[PDB]
C-alpha cells in the first residue's frame, strides 16, 4: 500500500494541466520510443494518469508530440 | 549505374518468420540489389527454421552486395524468429561496417481482426 | 437541462413564501420545465436510454408529489393544474 515507487510525485503539478503548453511535464511522463510510462514507474497518483493521458493525446493531433519515435 | 549502385552506406532489411527468413541489402533510399532465402540454398521447411540459415544467407547475399561494393550498411529487423540475432553476428563476420540496428517489429493498433485460429 | 438561473427565478413567483425552496408546488413546476426540455431533446434523438429512464423517474415523482398536494390541500391542487396547464 503501495509497493510501487514513491507516493506523491504530483507536488509540482495540479490542479489542471497541461494541456499542451508545457514540455516540462511532458517527456518526464513518457518513454523515448513514444509509448507511455505506466503508473508503476513514475510514482504519480491515479487521476493524473487519467489527465496526462488525454493531455498528450491532444498534443498528438496538434503534432506537438509523436505517435511514435523509434528512428 | 544503374544495375551497379556503388556506395559506402546502404540498407539491409531482414525477415524471419518461424519457418523462413529472407534478407536483402539495398540503398539508403532504398533500391534493391541482393537477397537470399534459406530455401534457395537447398534447405527445406524444417531446416529454414535454423539459426545457421541466418549466417549462410547473410554471407550469400553479402557477397554480391560487396561485389557492387559496400563498406557500411544499416540493418532493419522484423520477424520474431530465431535468426534475427544470428544473421547480425555472421554478417559482421563478412567484414562489413554496420553502425545501427533498428528493430521495427510492425505492430498495429488493432487495424483488423487477426485469425481466430487457434 | 436546466440552469440555475431559470430555476432560481421561477421559484420566486410560485414559492408559497419567501425563504422557501421546497413546498412541492415549486418541485412540480421545476420538474415540469425539465421534462419539457428533455422531451424535445428526446424527439430530436428518437433513441436513447438515459433520458427515458430519467424522465420516468421525474414524471413518476411528479405524480407522487401531486398526489400529496391533493390531500394536504385541494385548492392549491386545482390552482396549479390550471396555472401550469398540466395533468388533465
Amino acid at each position: 500500500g503501495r509497493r510501487r515507487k514513491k507516493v506523491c510525485y504530483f507536488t509540482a503539478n495540479g490542479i489542471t494541466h497541461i494541456d499542451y503548453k508545457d514540455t516540462e511535464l511532458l517527456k518526464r511522463f513518457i518513454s523515448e520510443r513514444g509509448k507511455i510510462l505506466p503508473r508503476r514507474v513514475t510514482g504519480t497518483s491515479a487521476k493524473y494518469q487519467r489527465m496526462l493521458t488525454t493531455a498528450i493525446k491532444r498534443s498528438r493531433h496538434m503534432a506537438l508530440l509523436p505517435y511514435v519515435k523509434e528512428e | 549505374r544503374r544495375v551497379k549502385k556503388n556506395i559506402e552506406n546502404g540498407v539491409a532489411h531482414i525477415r524471419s518468420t518461424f519457418n523462413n527468413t529472407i534478407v536483402t541489402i539495398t540503398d539508403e533510399f532504398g533500391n534493391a540489389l541482393s537477397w537470399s532465402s534459406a530455401g534457395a540454398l537447398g534447405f527445406k521447411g524444417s531446416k529454414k527454421s535454423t539459426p545457421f540459415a541466418a549466417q549462410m544467407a547473410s554471407e550469400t547475399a553479402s557477397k554480391s552486395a560487396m561485389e557492387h561494393g559496400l563498406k557500411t550498411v544499416e540493418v532493419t529487423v522484423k520477424g520474431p524468429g530465431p535468426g534475427r540475432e544470428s544473421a547480425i553476428r555472421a554478417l559482421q563476420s563478412a567484414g562489413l561496417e554496420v553502425t545501427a540496428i533498428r528493430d521495427v517489429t510492425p505492430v498495429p493498433h488493432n487495424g483488423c481482426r487477426p485469425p481466430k485460429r487457434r | 437541462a436546466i440552469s440555475q438561473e431559470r430555476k432560481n427565478e421561477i421559484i420566486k413567483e410560485y414559492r408559497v413564501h419567501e425563504t422557501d425552496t421546497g413546498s412541492p408546488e415549486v418541485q412540480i413546476a421545476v420538474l415540469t420545465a425539465e421534462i419539457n426540455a428533455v422531451n424535445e431533446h428526446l424527439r430530436t434523438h428518437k433513441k436513447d436510454h438515459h433520458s427515458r429512464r430519467g424522465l420516468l423517474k421525474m414524471v413518476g415523482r411528479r405524480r407522487h408529489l401531486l398526489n400529496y398536494l391533493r390531500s394536504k390541500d385541494i385548492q392549491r391542487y386545482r390552482e396549479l393544474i390550471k396555472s401550469l396547464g398540466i395533468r388533465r
Partner: protein, 96 residues
Amino acid sequence: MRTYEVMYIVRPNIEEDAKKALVERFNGILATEGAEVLEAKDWGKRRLAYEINDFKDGFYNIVRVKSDNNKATDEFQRLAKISDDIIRYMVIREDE
C-alpha cells in the same frame, strides 16, 4: 457563455503576406458573429514530430474566444477543411 481556446496550423510555403491577410481575416471569422476575439498570439514556427501533408515543419497560431457556443466553431470548421492553407486545427474548452 463559455471559454474556448483554439489552435490553427498553416504551411510555411505560403508568402508572408497571405499569412497576414489570412490571420486578420481569420480572427475576423471568429469575431464577426458577436463572439469575442479576446487574446490572439502566435506560437509561430516550429518543427513537427511528423509530417502531416508532406511538411516536416510548419506554423502555429493560438487565439482565444469566450462566447456562447454558436458563433465561432460553427464557422471555423466549415472554413477549415476546405481551405488548403489551414492544415489541422483543434478547439477545446477551458480544461487542462
